[PDB]
Nucleic acid binder design. Structure first.
Lengths: 140, 64, 143, 68, 63, 140, 143, 67
DNA sequence: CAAATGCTATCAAAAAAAAAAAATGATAGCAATCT
DNA sequence: AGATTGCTATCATTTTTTTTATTTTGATAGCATTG
């Protein structure tokens, strides 16, 4: 029950990817790692926003043929129930001084509905929403 | 690749045919999927290395 | 079918609700109106953020016991397919000028999939998404 | 709002023309009414006025914007 | 075979458009079908005669 | 309601149609008269067994555009529920000395299902199947 | 899908069921086998006509509490549309000598609409109906 | 019966060859098995034997012709 | 009256048929392996 | 050394996919005639 956040799933794709995060992703059981539609939408947009060239085209190729097919069946949707969670999480934090970006809240509420562990670089937002978190930039 | 399955129990065949149609697939596609899922299981994908590869291949990117 | 964006569903609940908008909502047949999960979220949070008192308790009840139930089964989730659409609706608008805010992209993208018409006061964005839009704040002319 | 109906059974036409004459209306007026009548039937609830009430019950609200 | 309906309440129009799509048919087919049903309800067919004639119309048959 | 046995619904078409039967069919409220798919099957077959020609062609035309459309929605299917009834109806009558043709059985059963009064010139069978009967060859 | 006629489903219940047939029935996926309301009518009538006693009673229960329920949702009715097929299956047979009886027509007709295969011991008739048949009593060869 | 599976990705294919080898059998024997187990799983009820039992329970019955 | 009717029209998009291309389901034929 | 297995191939369908006509809606525009 692990839910990758945008910044995590996209770390290995970067120029100087953090090897600690790659190693961690390499220690997981794919059949136990999820993605939020909101997160997939952010990835797909990231690809789509690239200037046209061989780069954008191969990336898209992979993104759809190699990467995304690995989570097929586990790309969680943001629905009505989850929308209620979102409201609680965000309204709560906000009225107690901690801000939670809508972007984050979406993932948070999702993780929160299936008691999943959000994996992310910015743990503040999630500790606040009362959601198990794991920063893969560390050890343990 | 092609593969021929002969001497297939009649029932086992009826059953697969059933699964296929009951899911709107041709029997052939059904078997193809089945064998596909099995391969899928047998395999342990290396998520971290998988991506970092695709990234090193395309000069790396930053999807925000 | 029509997809109501947050700001319309809110109009009637306001102090001096624009009459033209309320008139248009009544000229509608419920079973035709849909809401995006995103929008429900917004509504649900907009309520949660009010100072604790009587007003917020009632609104919260009416909200969950009256309003929303009326859209049961017609609340559209932001699923994986919709994401793909979202990806294009936004990259497109950008490499064309008018950029779209993610939230608005979710709604547009959702609407587009099912080729629905978005009812919003802020149409200025959606039209750039190649989705049909309608402003109930405005008058109808149609040819 | 106007709409045409071509290839309307000639029998149906007379039947409607008849019903209209029976009542004191024009054929168009009769169509308008047999139409408007079923429409009002589909109208299970009036969303506008519905939400308005909720508004009046609480003296009206002004939800925060919340949207980048 | 042709009729024009004008000054039609944009809303009644909505209601119809709706019942139309829900049954997978054009709005027009809908009116056509509605009017058609009205006519049928306004009509009283005399089953005996109606057949007795179709009968004499073809020289008589037996089933 | 009223279910028309095959012989009644087809009398008017016969060469020298019996006027008492025609006049009674004329006193009925169409919206209360039904047909069994079984009966509709024999009607249609009756038309099919005619030598291709104007007669057959027109009879067919009329049978599909003018007659059956009048019963649209009131043509009762022979289903499981009915099948059970049919089995009781025929078993009883038969193990009592009154043969009930499987033909008539299907109707009597359809009728006994929704509580209808069958119209037929063969009253004898139906009385034995415990179903309201009416002989349109008589009066009242 | 497969439509079982009366005689095939009757076999297993007999004194000395036909080995080959039973085996065949055994090689099927229940949810693929169906029954025409007609055939169900028959099976029930066949039961009802027995002499009163233990056998009849037991068999009755087995029929209603065990057999038929396995076919719930798969017992095909003889509805208006099937009737059209019917009229044509029989007419076409008469104009080719080989006559088809009403009962057989009903079953055939049903099968044809849903484009199924009739499993009967008397394929004799059904072939003239222009419908696929299969005799579980016979064997299976090449194509 | 027989069946030919065309357009089977070499990946899946190699996966199945491996499986078979590891399992000590031929690929055609492996697929035959893989399918068999699946089929065994769908076989909820055995209509013949099921009906047979009933027959055996009442000592067989000969049902009147009727048709 | 001007507004309302009853008919015929326009006219640019949506909403059966003819042709072209895949797959599917059944075997059929061999050379190279195992029993 | 006869059965099994691995690979291709033939072939009469089904099933799709793509093209190419035809119909139908939408929506509202003329025109001569009653609340």
């Amino acid at each position: 029950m692990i839910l990758l956040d945008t910044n995590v799933i996209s770390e290995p794709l970067r120029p100087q990817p953090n090897e600690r995060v790659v190693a961690w992703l390499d220690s997981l059981i794919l059949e136990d790692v999820y993605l939020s539609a909101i997160t997939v939408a952010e990835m797909r947009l990231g690809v789509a926003l690239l200037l046209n060239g061989k780069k954008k085209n191969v990336l898209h190729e992979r993104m759809e043929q190699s990467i995304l097919p690995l989570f097929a069946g586990r790309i969680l949707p943001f629905d009505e129930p989850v929308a209620a969670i979102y409201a609680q999480i965000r309204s709560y934090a906000k009225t107690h001084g901690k801000e939670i970006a809508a972007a984050d809240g979406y993932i948070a509420a999702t993780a929160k509905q299936h008691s999943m562990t959000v994996a992310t670089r910015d743990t503040g937002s999630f500790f606040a929403a009362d959601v198990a978190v794991f920063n893969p930039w560390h050890l343990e | 690749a092609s593969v021929v399955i002969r001497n297939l129990s009649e029932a086992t065949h009826n059953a697969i045919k059933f699964r296929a149609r009951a899911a709107g697939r041709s029997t052939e596609a059904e078997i193809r999927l089945i064998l596909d899922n099995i391969a899928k299981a047998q395999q342990t994908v290396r998520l971290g290395s998988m991506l970092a590869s695709i990234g090193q291949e395309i000069g790396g990117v930053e999807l925000e």
